[PDB]
Enzyme design. Structure first.
Site, PDB file in Angstrom:
ATOM      1  N   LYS A  98      61.762  38.042   2.681  1.00  0.00           N
ATOM      2  CA  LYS A  98      60.765  38.311   3.609  1.00  0.00           C
ATOM      3  C   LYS A  98      61.122  37.822   4.903  1.00  0.00           C
ATOM      4  O   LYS A  98      60.713  38.580   6.052  1.00  0.00           O
ATOM      5  CB  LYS A  98      59.568  37.452   2.853  1.00  0.00           C
ATOM      6  N   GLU A 156      54.982  28.749   8.626  1.00  0.00           N
ATOM      7  CA  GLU A 156      56.582  29.057   8.534  1.00  0.00           C
ATOM      8  C   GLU A 156      57.055  27.517   8.080  1.00  0.00           C
ATOM      9  O   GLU A 156      56.366  26.570   7.737  1.00  0.00           O
ATOM     10  CB  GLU A 156      57.060  29.556   9.467  1.00  0.00           C
ATOM     11  N   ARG A 157      58.335  27.241   8.460  1.00  0.00           N
ATOM     12  CA  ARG A 157      58.913  26.207   8.078  1.00  0.00           C
ATOM     13  C   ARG A 157      59.639  25.641   9.682  1.00  0.00           C
ATOM     14  O   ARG A 157      59.235  25.986  10.773  1.00  0.00           O
ATOM     15  CB  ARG A 157      60.242  26.402   7.557  1.00  0.00           C
TER      16      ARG A 157
HETATM   17  N1  LIG Z   1      70.610  41.417   4.076  1.00  0.00           N
HETATM   18  C1  LIG Z   1      70.964  40.256   3.058  1.00  0.00           C
HETATM   19  N2  LIG Z   1      72.344  40.168   2.525  1.00  0.00           N
HETATM   20  C2  LIG Z   1      72.390  38.920   1.826  1.00  0.00           C
HETATM   21  N3  LIG Z   1      71.598  37.976   1.731  1.00  0.00           N
HETATM   22  C3  LIG Z   1      70.317  38.064   2.189  1.00  0.00           C
HETATM   23  C4  LIG Z   1      69.822  39.273   3.157  1.00  0.00           C
HETATM   24  N4  LIG Z   1      68.667  39.124   3.482  1.00  0.00           N
HETATM   25  C5  LIG Z   1      68.257  37.800   2.930  1.00  0.00           C
HETATM   26  N5  LIG Z   1      69.056  37.344   2.191  1.00  0.00           N
HETATM   27  C6  LIG Z   1      69.074  36.075   1.452  1.00  0.00           C
HETATM   28  O1  LIG Z   1      67.449  35.682   0.911  1.00  0.00           O
HETATM   29  C7  LIG Z   1      67.436  34.326   1.245  1.00  0.00           C
HETATM   30  C8  LIG Z   1      65.802  34.547   1.819  1.00  0.00           C
HETATM   31  O2  LIG Z   1      65.609  32.860   1.899  1.00  0.00           O
HETATM   32  P1  LIG Z   1      64.152  32.453   2.538  1.00  0.00           P
HETATM   33  O3  LIG Z   1      63.857  33.214   3.882  1.00  0.00           O
HETATM   34  O4  LIG Z   1      64.117  30.984   2.620  1.00  0.00           O
HETATM   35  O5  LIG Z   1      63.023  32.981   1.348  1.00  0.00           O
HETATM   36  P2  LIG Z   1      62.039  34.333   1.670  1.00  0.00           P
HETATM   37  O6  LIG Z   1      62.920  35.177   2.159  1.00  0.00           O
HETATM   38  O7  LIG Z   1      61.435  34.521   0.454  1.00  0.00           O
HETATM   39  O8  LIG Z   1      61.191  33.823   2.904  1.00  0.00           O
HETATM   40  C9  LIG Z   1      68.323  33.896   2.259  1.00  0.00           C
HETATM   41  O9  LIG Z   1      68.869  32.592   1.729  1.00  0.00           O
HETATM   42  C10 LIG Z   1      69.500  34.862   2.413  1.00  0.00           C
HETATM   43  O10 LIG Z   1      70.731  34.324   1.956  1.00  0.00           O
HETATM   44 MG   LIG Z   2      60.251  33.293   5.385  1.00  0.00          MG
END
Ligand SMILES: Nc1ncnc2c1ncn2[C@@H]1O[C@H](COP(=O)(O)OP(=O)(O)O)[C@@H](O)[C@H]1O
Ligand SMILES: [Mg+2]
Ligand SMILES: Nc1ncnc2c1ncn2[C@@H]1O[C@H](COP(=O)(O)OP(=O)(O)OP(=O)(O)O)[C@@H](O)[C@H]1O
Ligand SMILES: [Mg+2]
Lengths: 471, 49, 163, 503
Positions: free
Chosen positions: A159, A185-186
């Site tokens: 997301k 957010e964080r």
């Molecule tokens: N295009 C991509 N390719 C590889 N990994 C991805 C990609 N997009 C997101 N991610 C992975 O998804 C994770 C999302 O983490 P985070 O942002 O903390 O949770 P959320 O996306 O639910 O907010 C990241 O750690 C990242 O490594």
């Molecule tokens: Mg997020």
């Protein structure tokens, strides 16, 4: 001056009851100032009135240090925030103060955060498509220009990476100004977003900026998180009505606005709803989503991100926001573990611009053919786990191989996710994505493997990856 | 559409200037407005009794 | 005997219950002057107000305030029984609400109320309300009436709705 | 025309001349839409109120010390100590024939910007439904335009057809196509064949109400269709009373001699607005955070749309409530209450919409309680044989993956069942008449479409409809005027379909 001075009578959590005089009591949604020990102040928004010359106010910060009988002066109006061109490039808070250590915001006017939405006669309908650069967004659910976009997904699905990758290829080349207002957010996500925009030309400290930063993560109390959506939307609404520019509001996340109001709803005298929510869930969500629309003065493309509670779309905070969004980009947790970057659902994502009169007759046939092949592969995969591949005929064998290559071709490497993937970022246009999907469904790329389309761009990157892997 | 917008803008501008002149006249201690308010309350109570 | 005045139902039932037994053998005129002396010697005095908000009291500081405000004050009938019912049920903190509801019963069954314009009206104790309002509005508009909002707000809202 | 602004200023000069009769009570507390008004002993139940700032209210919780009134606007205009005024009447709305062509709100005020509305009467929102002696049988047919709705679950005038479904699966698409298909009867002179639509958008956003009104005006369908605008950005009292205000305005046509059709979109948004005002008025809750009158709130507004007899006028009213389900579960809390009170429900699954069925209408889950009594005699002859062939092909649909082991009876049911399901799939905003749907259903049920391929089912629907309007125009016009099929109509339809199937 006739300042309405009040006395604190009760303080339990974020709610603080202030007792004033008879007749000089403040109205609802009014900012109440309070002198503390530091150089700042304690902003408090009046929610309701309990009576007997007393009104319950919700503090927008820490309530520690308030005693019974302190002075509580009223500002007379609501929570004023700085608007105009001076808010671009600076990190504003929920009360309209700078948090970037770059002096004060020299603004000529200050509008309130609480305002009414547009009427039915001032609404302007449109049917324009917006190119994002992804292969699964330009073929399945296309984003509408000037509408509300919702990136639904669970925790750890993608997301936060979806909103950052789209802002580096659409907001950096747009004519209007951006408005990144993060709510819930964080702490680490706020510092990484401001440093990435300065190296790309979106926020210039010594030049010109076109992106408004609004702070307010989960490090504060419940009053600052619920009021972060109204403070960030006030600066973007002034650029589209008074100035007339196509603003782009980026909310991350949109699910934090509904959860912040339910945390203080139990102490305000309200009964709980379903799944521990507040009774005014549909009233509070509709008042803020209707104001971020497109009127006759300008457009506003809202690209908010909804967070599903533990991967559940039947919740009261996820199902209520699906009726106020044109394009919905729902993400699944099962496609992210297989290698699809990102996990874009080709059947759960829907949009209002996916018709034959907006995208054309050629683009309408490619979207219907890709959805029919992906839906038919789910029914045939259940029979192979019990009977095997011997029950499939000639038509069922070719459909299973074409469905696996079409799912990996829509996953392209983003530019912001280069530290986790390793490969470079690729951006495909709208004309290249429709031509590559129509040629694979006819039988022109049936001899190629499934690894040549995974983590690639358009039709040009799929032919170069097949020849290099065979050598 | 241009004739309707020009007619609506002229009517909205004339109504705003007339509202500002009526509010500025009542704040200048109008002697005729204070005497007319007391006579209107006594005539309305006698007609209902 | 219950008079038609409603006056809430839970908080306003304190003075209405004692008014039935106090309306016998002409004992309603002495209750008005005795109820005003109990509130004036506990508010602006800063002496006997040390147990108004505290949860102590308990017989000692609860029965001593009802005997000092009746023997040496101005009470001899059934005025001392009103403070004893509020001391055992923990109701001495709202002494102003019990004294304000007693004066509203004598002004409703033996006089008019409501309002009209500017300040208060006349509140006559004749009979009907129509014959007393027309004879008092003509004599009060001429004498005084400085007339120093409602009519200006209604005229501005009608012009904005038609534009 | 010659200073138009001077005509409106002279008529609005003298109006306020009798407003010296006090008002009602005051206000003690206000918040989250509630307003504890102290006083107003002469105020009745469900009566309209007015504050000192201009916001209206509805006193629904009449207590002894105070009076709970729900404000229809924002809570910032009301404060502690504001004077309240009583209107003296109940919650009513405007009705009549002058409301057709303008978008009204929840109280009857026009929001489209087309001037005033010539209201011929004033009806209350909380009105009683019809009795068992003033109701007749459903005999009139409701032309929806869809081929799979006019043959399977055919709805009639006076019945309640529910539109259940998930998110984006054909919920509002079935209600919009049925209202736009009435242009062939409303543009004529027959008043008994016309049906005035009544779209009640409740719970939707501001952009969704503007897009639906613009599409109906371009196809000449907004001149005889009431639009009840009720967005989610207003108060909880305006959204909860949207179902009662839209039913009172549409009831004037059924009580005079005309037909109406209400479309409560949606039924799930109306239940959330009623529970929000009851939770803030200090009341006990029940199941799924709802009040005690959860089943009585939806059954009272749906029972008023019935078909009257000949002694009452001969009118009827249709109720099309859309039940927005969660994840396909039709046995929930608000889903089970609306399906048990209505006489039929149209299910819409999200799996059949992505395959090619436009729209996704499950024949095994959707059924009508009226049956074939409220349909045309010409379409009832072809719908009888197609119902048995569609039910047998659904249970034997699992043998389609093994086409090399099919028998004689298994190959005939699979070929005929696939052509009948693809011929009923229509595009968006493309409704068909009763004469065009009777010729397409007879060619697939007899066996004239089994020789064609599965991919040529889309091209055969437009080729057979265009050739029948120029060569055999007498057969299509006789099936729509008479509404039945005699012995001469059956022999002429079989000879024309056999000669066109050879090319
Ligand atoms: N295009 C991509 N390719 C590889 N990994 C991805 C990609 N997009 C997101 N991610 C992975 O998804 C994770 C999302 O983490 P985070 O942002 O903390 O949770 P959320 O996306 O639910 O907010 C990241 O750690 C990242 O490594
Ligand atoms: Mg997020
Ligand atoms: N039979 C059909 N054929 C093609 N497209 C359809 C069909 N039915 C619906 N659609 C598409 O689905 C979209 C949404 O339709 P509809 O308004 O009926 O549902 P919705 O109200 O958007 O659902 P939700 O309220 O869950 O968002 C429309 O943009 C339309 O293009
Ligand atoms: Mg809908």
């Amino acid at each position: 001056a006739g300042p309405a001075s009040g006395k604190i009578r009760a303080v339990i959590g974020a709610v603080v009851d202030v007792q004033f005089e008879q007749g000089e009591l403040p109205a609802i949604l009014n900012a109440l100032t309070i002198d503390q020990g530091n150089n700042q102040k304690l902003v408090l928004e009046v929610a309701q009135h309990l009576g007997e010359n007393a009104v319950r106010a919700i503090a927008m910060d820490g309530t520690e240090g308030l005693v019974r009988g302190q002075t509580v002066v009223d500002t007379g109006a609501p929570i004023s925030v700085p608007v105009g061109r001076g808010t671009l490039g600076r990190i504003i808070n929920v009360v309209g103060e700078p948090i970037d250590e770059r002096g004060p915001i020299e603004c000529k006017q200050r509008n309130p955060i609480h305002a009414d939405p547009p009427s039915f006669v001032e609404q302007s309908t449109e049917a324009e498509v917006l190119e994002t650069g992804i292969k699964v967004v330009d073929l399945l659910a296309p984003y509408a220009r000037g509408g509300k976009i919702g990136l639904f997904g669970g925790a750890g699905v993608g997301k936060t990476v979806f909103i950052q990758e789209l802002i580096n290829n659409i907001a950096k080349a747009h004519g209007g100004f951006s408005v990144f207002t993060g709510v819930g957010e964080r702490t680490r996500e706020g510092n990484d977003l401001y440093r990435e925009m300065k190296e790309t030309g979106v926020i210039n400290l010594e030049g010109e900026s076109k992106v408004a930063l609004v702070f307010g993560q989960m490090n504060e109390p419940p009053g600052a998180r619920a009021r972060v959506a109204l403070t960030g939307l006030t600066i973007a609404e002034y650029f589209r009505d008074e100035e007339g520019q196509d603003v782009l509001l980026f909310v991350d996340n949109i699910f934090r606005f509904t959860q912040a109001g339910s945390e203080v709803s139990a102490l305000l005298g309200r009964i709980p709803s379903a799944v521990g929510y507040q009774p005014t869930l549909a009233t509070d969500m509709g008042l803020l989503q209707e104001r971020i629309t497109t009127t006759r003065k300008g457009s506003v493309t809202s690209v908010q991100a909804v967070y599903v509670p533990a991967d559940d779309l039947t919740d009261p905070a996820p199902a209520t926001t699906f009726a106020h969004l044109d394009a919905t980009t729902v993400l699944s947790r099962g496609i992210s573990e297989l290698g699809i970057y990102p996990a874009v659902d080709p059947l759960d994502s829907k949009s209002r611009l996916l018709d034959v009169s907006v995208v054309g007759q050629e683009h309408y046939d490619v979207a219907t053919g890709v959805q029919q092949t992906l839906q038919a592969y789910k029914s045939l995969q259940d029979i192979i786990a019990i009977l095997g591949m011997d029950e499939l005929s000639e038509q069922d064998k070719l459909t299973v191989e074409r469905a696996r290559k079409i799912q990996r071709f829509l996953s392209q490497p983003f530019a912001v996710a280069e530290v986790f993937t390793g490969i470079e970022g690729k951006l495909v246009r709208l004309k290249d994505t429709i031509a590559s999907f129509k040629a694979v469904l006819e039988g022109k790329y049936d001899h190629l493997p499934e690894n040549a389309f995974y983590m690639v761009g358009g039709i040009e990157d799929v032919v170069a990856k097949a020849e290099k892997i065979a050598a | 559409r241009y004739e309707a917008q020009v007619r609506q803008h002229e009517q909205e501008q004339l109504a705003s200037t007339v509202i500002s002149k009526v509010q500025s006249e009542l704040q200048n201690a109008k002697f005729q407005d204070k005497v007319l308010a007391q006579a209107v309350e006594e005539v309305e109570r006698l007609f209902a009794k | 005997i219950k008079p038609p005045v409603q006056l809430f139902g839970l908080d306003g039932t304190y003075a209405t219950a004692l008014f039935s037994a106090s309306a016998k053998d002409s004992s309603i005129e002495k209750t008005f002057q005795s109820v005003q002396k109990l509130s004036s010697t506990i508010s602006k005095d800063a002496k006997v107000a040390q147990v108004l908000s505290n949860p102590a009291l308990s017989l000692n500081s609860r029965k001593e305030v009802v005997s000092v405000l009746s023997k040496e004050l101005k009470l001899e009938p059934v005025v001392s029984n009103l403070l004893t019912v509020l001391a055992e049920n923990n109701r001495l903190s709202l002494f102003d609400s019990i004294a304000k509801q007693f004066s509203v019963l004598n002004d409703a069954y033996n006089g008019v109320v409501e309002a009209t314009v500017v300040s208060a009206k006349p509140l006559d104790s004749k009979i009907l309300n129509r014959l007393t309002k027309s004879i008092t509005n003509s004599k009060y508009v001429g004498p005084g009436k400085t007339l120093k909002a409602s009519k200006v707000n209604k005229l501005n809202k009608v012009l904005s709705e038609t534009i | 025309p010659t200073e138009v602004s001077s005509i409106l200023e002279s008529k609005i000069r003298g109006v306020s001349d009798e407003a010296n009769l006090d008002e009602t009570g005051r206000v003690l507390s206000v918040g989250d839409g509630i307003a504890r008004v102290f006083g107003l002993n002469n105020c009745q139940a469900e009566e309209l109120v007015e504050f000192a700032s201009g916001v209206k209210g509805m006193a629904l919780n009449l207590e002894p010390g105070q009076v709970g009134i729900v404000l229809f606007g924002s809570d910032r205009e009301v404060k502690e100590g504001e004077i309240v005024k009583r209107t003296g009447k109940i919650v009513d709305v405007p009705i009549g024939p002058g409301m057709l062509g303008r978008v009204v709100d929840a109280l009857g005020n026009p929001i489209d910007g087309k001037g005033p509305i010539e209201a011929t009467g004033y009806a209350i929102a909380q009105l009683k439904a019809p009795g068992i002696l003033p109701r007749r049988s459903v005999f009139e047919p409701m032309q929806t335009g869809l081929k799979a709705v006019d043959a399977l679950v055919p709805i009639g005038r006076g019945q309640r057809e529910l539109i259940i479904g998930d998110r984006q699966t054909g919920k509002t698409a079935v209600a919009l196509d049925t209202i736009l298909n009435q242009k062939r009867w409303n543009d004529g002179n027959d008043e008994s064949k016309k049906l005035y639509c009544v779209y009640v958008a409740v719970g939707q956003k501001r952009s969704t109400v503007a897009q639906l009104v613009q599409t109906l005006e371009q196809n000449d369908a907004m001149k005889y269709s009431i639009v009840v605008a009720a967005t989610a950005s207003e108060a909880a009292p305006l959204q909860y009373l949207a179902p009662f205000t839209a039913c009172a305005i549409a009831e004037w046509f059924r009580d005079n001699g005309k037909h109406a059709l209400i479309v409560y979109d949606d039924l799930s948004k109306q239940a959330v607005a009623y529970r929000q005002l009851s939770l803030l008025l200090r009341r006990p809750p029940g199941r799924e955070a709802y009040p005690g009158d959860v089943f009585y709130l939806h059954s009272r507004l749906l029972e008023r749309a019935a078909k009257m007899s000949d002694a009452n006028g001969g009118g009827s009213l249709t109720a099309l409530p859309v039940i927005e389900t969660q994840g396909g579960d039709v046995s929930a809390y608000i889903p089970t209450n609306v399906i048990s009170i209505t006489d039929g429900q149209i299910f819409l699954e999200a799996e059949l919409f992505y395959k090619g069925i436009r729209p996704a209408i499950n024949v095994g889950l959707s059924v009508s309680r009226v049956g074939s009594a409220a349909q045309v005699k010409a379409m009832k002859q072809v719908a009888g044989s197609l119902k048995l062939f569609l039910a047998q092909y659904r249970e034997v649909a699992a043998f389609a993956q093994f086409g090399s082991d099919l028998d004689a009876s298994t190959k005939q049911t699979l070929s005929r069942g696939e052509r009948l399901t693809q011929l009923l799939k229509q595009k968006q905003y493309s409704p068909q008449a009763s004469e065009e749907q009777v010729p397409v259903i007879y060619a697939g049920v007899n066996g004239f479409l089994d020789n064609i391929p599965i991919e040529r089912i889309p091209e055969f629907e437009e080729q057979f409809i265009a050739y029948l309007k120029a060569n055999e125009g007498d057969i299509l016009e006789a099936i729509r005027t008479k509404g039945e099929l005699s012995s001469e109509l059956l022999d002429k339809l079989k000879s024309a379909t056999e000669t066109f199937v050879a090319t």
